[model samples]
Target: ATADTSPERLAAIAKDALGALNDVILKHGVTYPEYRVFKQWLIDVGEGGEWPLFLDVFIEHSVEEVLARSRKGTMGSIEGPYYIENSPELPSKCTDPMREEDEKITPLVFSGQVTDLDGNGLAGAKVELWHADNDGYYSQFAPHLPEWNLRGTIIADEEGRYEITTIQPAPYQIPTDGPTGQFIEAQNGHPWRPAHLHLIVSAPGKESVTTQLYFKGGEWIDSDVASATKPELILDPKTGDDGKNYVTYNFVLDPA
Candidate 1:
């Protein structure tokens, strides 16, 4: 085995072994090595890229077909732990209906369309979106947050058009009290993720698409601690006539 790669794997295995051992030991009314270290180690495995992993992916038919067509539109990104099933529908103008009127928020108007590989729009498609608040905390995970603070679903018109408004999401750090945090600290790095939004769009006949969007020129776009950054997924924000920051990002899904 290669000198560098093998030892890293071995060290990670040792961490996992200790974690499993701790889990079993804790059941016996004993906190052997404490849960903090174990929890942090698991985060390391996820964010450390110990195994082969990827984000902001482009899929055509399968792995064999991904690079065959990469120029159509935005590729899919990870659906983080914050997605809520059955997000409320925005029957009219799409905005964060649950946000407080007095709460200060940066206006964001996101408009996009779902299309096929050939650039033909997929009308009547449905899209779901969720993202963290301005503080980089998801509503479900944050205290005193609305049920669907920054989440909603939009039904595309007959022409596959959709638009919604929300606050300009801000960058946030990962949980730093865990193993991943220790690892990053040891490496002299910061655990900051980029400002981004999530989306899952589906058409009747085609397989659904799940992805996230990175703000163009947003903080940590280049050094996302999660290693989820992609140049193609980065979107430019501009001021629209509505006097809010606006961005347009179209999606092109492959046939199932």
Candidate 2:
């Protein structure tokens, strides 16, 4: 299975990656105080090592476009800076993210269907849901939340329909202790993610789709710092005859 493990082969790959970076430096003609300032900043932040902040500013920036372009079904987005894989699974219904104490936020009835490209429902799919609370803090990231607050999983029905009740998410600032916030301050940019819910949907023979659903009119919906917003992912919630707010979205999947 191994083709070649020689030092020559290793050097070849290194040459390719670093060669491009060198090319950029050469293009800019990185000289004088401009380049020196960059080196000084690196030395300033190097001891702390802003890898997490680097992920938010650089890697997460281009992740959604690449993933969505590779897939064939529902457009995907980055999983964001916070997501816990060990969420509690709800076999039938999911309602953990909604609490009675947050009476100011509207009770929501978010519904959607999962299907293949031919419009056939994929029953028994696993759908995980997570979002921020009224105060813009996620249960997974903030210690003040109850266990499993704003996080739960649900199973699609026989007809591939999944619905749940939760409080509508609100706009919130990104974590400020890391390099993401520092980068924003350096550029004088806002550090906010719009009101939205995170989801990961999968089934037995289909590709899992990780995405976020954005409310139509919320702060940073059009200007998210991570640059993950798109027209197709936006939802317009409306008040139903039952006096509850709701929105519908359909997710299509690629074959496994």
Candidate 3:
């Protein structure tokens, strides 16, 4: 991401965001009592270090959507707040870093190819993938799990094909014990996001696609709190004879 933090740019950006909020307040005829409560809530959110979480969950999709308008390849999705760069690399065909408990869960054999806009393979593409555990916890975010569990950067083979074995992640709610939760509670909103796999796919001289892949008919799929799902991004994996779910999805990238 390039910075455009010049004085004029900053002013214009802040005015757009703040002016939108002002419009909402004016439309609702906001009361000072409500405003005071919101002020305190913002303080609590900042103090709790939940501004990142709150904004990513509630606001980042709009930004992603705007950026997606210029793209014609894979659909873009919010990066969310859990991504960590430089995960250990694995072969084109490999398993995710997972615990024994994860093995017991239904394994998903996710196989895919990376291609250019014209459907030609892009050799040596990198598919960096990370997802929550079956219990809905990310490795680094949840202290009990190993740091790289369910995460890996799978290098696609010469033909840009890859096969990764991993457990299917379950739907999870955003932390409901913090100020973000309180904000949701005040609005009678639920904070559940659908189960999904986060990925960043790239090849030399091609634009990287940062996206989330969701399951067909997954819980909260229609009502993801983050509002990040798209029809093209859903996977309809079939159960294989070995009892593992299998699906193939190819990513197409535009030129860098």
Candidate 4:
């Protein structure tokens, strides 16, 4: 014979779970009404629906945790749907050809070492980068711009240092053609993303991290739609008399 489960027991579980859930949502500062609706639906379904049937309950919980961690003292907006699926390949030691002719285009030098948490340099790591131009429109998004504009990939040297030159990105608005954009506007917030560069860092025997580096003091640093911003990743551009502006950034990887 099984002991009867009291309503109080069930209520206690729900109360506890919902409390934690609310904290997760509030930490990320998500004010969208749709999120609230979804959250309520999850709770309702979780109580009346079968335990296993409410798989989305667990998924929502996991998503909340990720958002909380990603937002922990971070600065910059999360990335949206505008990212490119394919990146252009560049020679091992080549510079952007447009560097010589363009003054508005600043040269950003990203140099970093790929290493395990134990500090062992890992050679042959590949880093991919992409970003918008000073006008805030990606190549594909802007019909007038050249194809595959502002994107490249480079491999790390034996010493784990990699260098690449690119133009500084400009902050831009999120596309208004989607529901996400409508939700943002309804909340009285602009859909602009901070000026930043997309980075995909990968090496053998370690988990790959896809992240973006924000330009410090750029607009939309705090109000990104994807909520993927991190504070330590912000960079400052360096100005020189050599006629090109430069910024250097370093990345540290976790152990495999």
Candidate 5:
């Protein structure tokens, strides 16, 4: 409920929303059986507590786009339902918290600088980041993982530069056992999101930027179920002689 939405406006919006569905029903001649199935599925989704997952996957991108029309810096992406606030803080050049088994995977050293629209670095910038593990499981979402695996708030240097070390997250499908998955299954659609690093970069007196960075040739890049990929957000990390992957990206923030 937006504070500025008047009752008349809400009524019109609600009426038109239902009217659109009515138009679809009339156009497709949707039968009672199909309607009942859709109703049941909606109930199932509610029972499974997947409204957040469902809406974030299917609806949030459009809202993000509407918000993006006013921005001049980096493009924004949907912050999927796995983000948690107040993660462990680390220095600019620190590695994320990981398990012994996680260390075996190839390391990805993501380096970046946070700057304003004028291309000047912001001295007190912080990059808050969270991502799935190589197994495509987020920490808090999966009981077997630690509380803060692969999540951190990196304090950037005076130049707003940071070099974080973490494992390359793998592409993951939304939980296939839930109602959301059943909805996808009913439509014969795939549920896959590209492997991405979710970040929120912020500095004093400037707007915070929430976005995701994907690999150059990652799976689901072209057909992300969430529809959140962007051309400017891809990273092409090169492998170093020591077997570590390295890449550099910079974030530009607009004035608050």
Candidate 6:
């Protein structure tokens, strides 16, 4: 009983247990993918520079965001290193940024509500959102495109409902210039992500959640590269007779 309560003894026991576990793995010639990932993770953490630090912080924030939701769903793929060079465009929302003399994809009107765990409306909550255009390319990622073409922020109404107008996102290929992308392709998997909208919902006295809503019946819905797929997050697409398409989705927030 005394040994069990002793911190030094517990530490020694933990050390021995870890050693034993490692010895067992060595004896069995275990070649788990996680083991390789763990080694690479150590190297990455040790690099400890601006980019790695950014990645660490980003991952930590992402984990917290997902945990705040407390749902077993995908939070969308992180664009990671490739997205770093792109800055958030000031005054992101625009009525019609494209001045080309041609009609583009039909506009959509999206509306939703944010509420607390007890179903109380969260007034003044900020909903920040972004998505790819019908061509599957984001604003900064695409050449000759205006900055923040489809990104915006809206403050929740008194009843917590927020609405916005935008174009539908198209399925896009994940950036193929990173190690993660190379690894994905080496596995014989295409790097296309399903059509989805990115959102970061936040409110005072409540936890914030950053998530993506995938379109239902998309090709890559079941095989996301980051393993961030959830059936419930798939949204049903709507058709309109006025040559427009729309989708409605609700965002639920658990208690802080």
What pairs collide in candidate 2?
Answer: none
Which residue runs of candidate 3 sit more than 4 Å off their true CA positions? none
Candidate 4 residue 65 Cα shift, in angstroms, is 5.6
- Please give, for residues 190-239, the per-residue lDDT of candidate 3 as tens digits: 89999999999999999999999999999999999999999999999999
Mark the 10 consecutive residues where model 4 has the least summed lDDT. 49-58
> Each model's number of backbone clashes?
3, 0, 0, 1, 0, 0
Please estimate how well model 1 matches the true structure, expressed as its whole-model Cα lDDT.
Answer: 0.72
Q: Residue 92 CA error for candidate 6 (Å)?
A: 14
lDDT computed for candidate 2:
0.79
Model 4: per-residue Cα lDDT over 57-114, one tens digit each? 1233345446445432222233343566556666545443332333367666665576
- Pairs with steric clashes in candidate 5: none
Which candidate do you rate higher for lDDT, 3 or 4? 3
- Could you tell me which 10 consecutive residues in candidate 5 have the lowest summed lDDT? 1-10
Candidate 6, residues 1-256: lDDT per residue as tens digits? 2444688878897999899989988998878786897577556545543343234323444554556456432233343332222334222122323324214767766677777766677876767777777766666667956776676666667777866666766776765555545445667877776777777776787666666777778878887654555576787868788866666666666545
The total number of steric clashes, by the backbone 3 Å criterion, in model 6 comes to 0
Off by over 4 Å in 1: 1-73, 101-103
Compute each candidate's TM-score over C-alphas: 0.71, 0.82, 0.97, 0.64, 0.96, 0.66
lDDT of 2 by residue, 1-256 (tens): 3765799888997998799978988998987786787776666456556655456545785867876777889878778766888788875445654566765677788888889988899887878888888887877567877768878888788878878888878887776665446657888888887888899988879989998889888778878877887788998999988777898888898998
TM-score of 6: 0.66
By lDDT, rank the candidates, best first.
3, 5, 2, 1, 6, 4
Residue-wise C-alpha lDDT for candidate 5, range 1-256, written one tens digit per residue? 4479899999998999999999999999999999999999999999999999999999999989997999999888998899899999999999999999899999999998999998999899999999988788999999999999999999999999999999987897898899999888978998999989999999999889889999999999999999999999999999999999999999999999
Evaluate residue 135 in candidate 1 and report its C-alpha lDDT on the 0 to 100 scale. 66
For model 4, what is the C-alpha lDDT against the true structure? 0.62
In candidate 1, where is summed lDDT lowest over 10 consecutive residues? 52-61
lDDT of 5 at 207: 88
Each model's C-alpha lDDT? 0.72, 0.79, 0.93, 0.62, 0.93, 0.62
